[PDB]
Symmetry: D3
Subunit: 151 residues, 6 copies
Amino acid sequence: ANCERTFIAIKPDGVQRGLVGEIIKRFEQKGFRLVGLKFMQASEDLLKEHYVDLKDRPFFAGLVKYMHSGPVVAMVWEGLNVVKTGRVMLGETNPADSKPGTIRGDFCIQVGRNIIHGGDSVESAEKEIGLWFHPEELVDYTSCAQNWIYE
Amino acid sequence: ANCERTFIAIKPDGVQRGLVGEIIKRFEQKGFRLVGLKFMQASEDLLKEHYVDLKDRPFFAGLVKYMHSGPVVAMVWEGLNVVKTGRVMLGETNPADSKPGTIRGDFCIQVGRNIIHGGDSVESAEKEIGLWFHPEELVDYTSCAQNWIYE
Amino acid sequence: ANCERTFIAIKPDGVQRGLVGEIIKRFEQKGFRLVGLKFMQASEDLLKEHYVDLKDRPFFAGLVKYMHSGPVVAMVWEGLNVVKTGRVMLGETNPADSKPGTIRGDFCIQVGRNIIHGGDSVESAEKEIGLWFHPEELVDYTSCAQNWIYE
Amino acid sequence: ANCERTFIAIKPDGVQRGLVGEIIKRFEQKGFRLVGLKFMQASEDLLKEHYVDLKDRPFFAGLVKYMHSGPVVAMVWEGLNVVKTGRVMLGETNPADSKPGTIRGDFCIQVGRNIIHGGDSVESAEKEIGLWFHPEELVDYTSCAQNWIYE
Amino acid sequence: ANCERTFIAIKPDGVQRGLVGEIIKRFEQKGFRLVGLKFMQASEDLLKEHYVDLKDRPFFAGLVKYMHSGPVVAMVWEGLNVVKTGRVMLGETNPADSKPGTIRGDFCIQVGRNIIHGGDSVESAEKEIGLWFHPEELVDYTSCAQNWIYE
Amino acid sequence: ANCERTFIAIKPDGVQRGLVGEIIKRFEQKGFRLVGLKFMQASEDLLKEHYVDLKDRPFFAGLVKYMHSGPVVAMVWEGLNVVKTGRVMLGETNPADSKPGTIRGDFCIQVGRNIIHGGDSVESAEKEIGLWFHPEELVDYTSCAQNWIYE
Ligand SMILES: Nc1ncnc2c1ncn2[C@@H]1O[C@H](COP(=O)(O)OP(=O)(O)O)[C@@H](O)[C@H]1O
Ligand SMILES: Nc1ncnc2c1ncn2[C@@H]1O[C@H](COP(=O)(O)OP(=O)(O)O)[C@@H](O)[C@H]1O
Ligand SMILES: Nc1ncnc2c1ncn2[C@@H]1O[C@H](COP(=O)(O)OP(=O)(O)O)[C@@H](O)[C@H]1O
Ligand SMILES: Nc1ncnc2c1ncn2[C@@H]1O[C@H](COP(=O)(O)OP(=O)(O)O)[C@@H](O)[C@H]1O
Ligand SMILES: Nc1ncnc2c1ncn2[C@@H]1O[C@H](COP(=O)(O)OP(=O)(O)O)[C@@H](O)[C@H]1O
Ligand SMILES: Nc1ncnc2c1ncn2[C@@H]1O[C@H](COP(=O)(O)OP(=O)(O)O)[C@@H](O)[C@H]1O
């Protein structure tokens, strides 16, 4: 199998446009394991630390504002190449470059309202998971299909 | 509209059998608002208080064991008649009496593995919400469709 | 077979909440033939002639205004007992009494925002059709699946 | 759990209208276990024996001919009360009488083109299983999720 | 946001094979806004003008005849780069060349039966809009979720 | 049109994870004709003759065992370029390289549990068909939608 983890976040447009069940379903049906799940109004401090590598960017302020302007769904998902492949499943950062079949390709249009965030790397995801989740909140268990998902 | 709330819980068979996204989707698409959402390995104490009115019942022990044996998804949903209608959406307690179209009617078979719990009343739901959720964890916001959902 | 027709209209809340395709799907997969399909902001006059019989009632004032406040998808469907069955597929007028699996049961909450209308009798349907559609807009053709839908 | 089985056949109209996957998906998602599956053009002899308790009905000769006019998907499914709950899933003999959420309620219109057959009792269904299948065609395995579907 | 529009037509094969709802649902769920919708049997004249830039092609005469052999669903859709991203959603002219996740990739096989048309440029698409619709048939309204689809 | 055929088999992980109906759906909605469909525990001999060309390789040992450890759904589908397009719909052999919208891209994670097999050439397909099916099990009939799928 593989116990590798990623942080996935449903941005507040996703919640507003009723895409939560649908986004979760796509991770479930793929075979990934739900580790942690929280529905939270997120803070500016939290978001700034998360998006620190983009402090140098003109969109930063607006991004943090858009990211603070409503509830998000904070999620951890476990599996083999889950960081990498989860990003393929999301599609490109810009929805207009995201292929049909992906979450953004199917469900959104404009870069500044792209419904969903995913960990760009394992390093980042761990940083992000810890930042967003306490270790208490992370749940561990075995999928009843595990042996059919992984040899 | 209506700000009435209910506690809905996805029992650990639901999580195991990959029905979370699908169960959430059915509440979203109905028009109900996500208030609170937690993915938690629940305790025996928590469950016993929740299922206290059934202490007198032969299945109680097993129920609590089944309910403790894996992660659950704790949920709060807001809307007009949400307690009552959410129970219709779940179907009957026994899946063999639940009509096709309902969650249990579509997704499960046996009373002791009925994937999902719902608040039997407002009183119960409040008791249950408080029992399961802290007020910090409950999120409040306005649906961008609210005026099309409610006159 | 049968050439019975009904009139189905998707209301503005139905359109605003992105349910047009889902609804049409339900009629298609059932095996009913699409005869007529337009998209329109309905004039107050038309809405008054359409809802004529409910003038006396106290929700007529807000009704016409709300049905004029956005676009409607006006439809004609054909088949054996479309009128009667169409109404069953829609569910009860009040969504609180609408069973899961129905359009209203699955997708809406309050009667003032009940997403859809269907004709209540063959008589009403043909009247509504004459009112919303011009004859030349009703299209005639034979389903390729016809002999598999009807004996 | 339960080792009870039922016989389900997708009739020629169900095959022709593209509902094989949809119908299998409903039995799969319900938790029932697939035991037998075959694709075939049923003989008049087989069909006359299958429908022997109806030889005295006005619709009998046409039923046989219609059922012989294209291929069918014969299936065997296992689970607790799978015969009775399988029938609830199909709907009523008459699609008009079948509720939205049921296979016939959603997917078909006319009694003579009702897309699917199900055993009407445990005894009928085993008689039907022995008739369409050899015991060696029936496959035995255990669902990876069985502990989660049955207590 | 963006007020750019495109023309989309569901071809006779798309109507006949029950994909009207499915196709509308994909544009709806993507965040694009429905502007115009009509159901009609297109004339040879209209179709010859629609396809005027192809009058010199070997497939032209048959394309026109096929497009005239049953009814089509004519639509207008609005949004940022809706013309270009609308084409990405459809797939390639040849279904064989279209990727899973696209409308043609999922729903059809042969180039001469590719179920759907889309404007190939902003200028083509407006020319196509003016040709199939009168400006008064196009409906103006604002999506309740527009702040969440566009920054 | 075209009478080209391919061989598609759902593997035991595909069956165990409840994906049989979903997969068949994908081929149906595309417009390919179901020719053959059986459900079987495949004998080690058959699996060795089937996977003959991969005897040398180091995963052959675990392969046969795993493909014998549960049931497979063996299928024959017909249509223009089924073989080549069928493989595209399936996705790349390794699910990590499989694009969203594909069967493997949507539903599985690791190559050892890649849920499905499709023939890699017309030659292989016909060989596999001769191996898994008896001639009399391949059913001939004409889709009611045929003239709408092919020119
Ligand atoms: N050009 C832009 N304009 C507005 N917002 C942007 C832009 N680029 C990126 N963003 C926002 O910042 C987030 C982070 O950007 P980046 O880390 O480069 O991509 P990703 O989110 O795919 O990791 C994006 O998801 C998006 O919400
Ligand atoms: N006869 C039974 N056998 C095993 N478990 C049962 C039985 N009846 C009820 N339960 C379990 O106890 C839970 C609570 O029962 P009850 O409050 O009567 O119904 P509900 O859950 O519909 O409110 C059920 O959801 C189910 O998990
Ligand atoms: N008490 C009410 N308050 C607000 N709107 C109502 C009320 N009752 C009915 N309506 C609206 O008026 C429409 C017409 O009412 P009626 O003819 O009784 O139902 P239907 O349209 O199902 O035949 C309904 O579709 C509904 O949206
Ligand atoms: N009045 C009728 N006209 C045409 N066909 C009928 C009629 N009644 C029943 N049939 C056909 O005969 C089949 C067997 O009938 P029956 O055994 O009474 O119902 P069921 O299939 O629900 O057990 C039905 O599934 C249906 O296709
Ligand atoms: N080689 C062909 N054979 C039959 N029909 C074709 C062929 N090429 C194109 N067509 C038809 O003509 C339509 C218009 O062609 P074109 O404008 O080149 O593609 P598009 O529709 O992608 O803009 C296509 O949608 C297709 O149905
Ligand atoms: N490195 C590997 N480890 C385990 N199983 C493998 C590996 N490579 C291939 N397989 C399995 O063997 C099957 C046959 O391999 P191959 O013929 O290369 O792929 P395909 O079946 O897509 O043509 C694949 O479907 C896959 O499940």
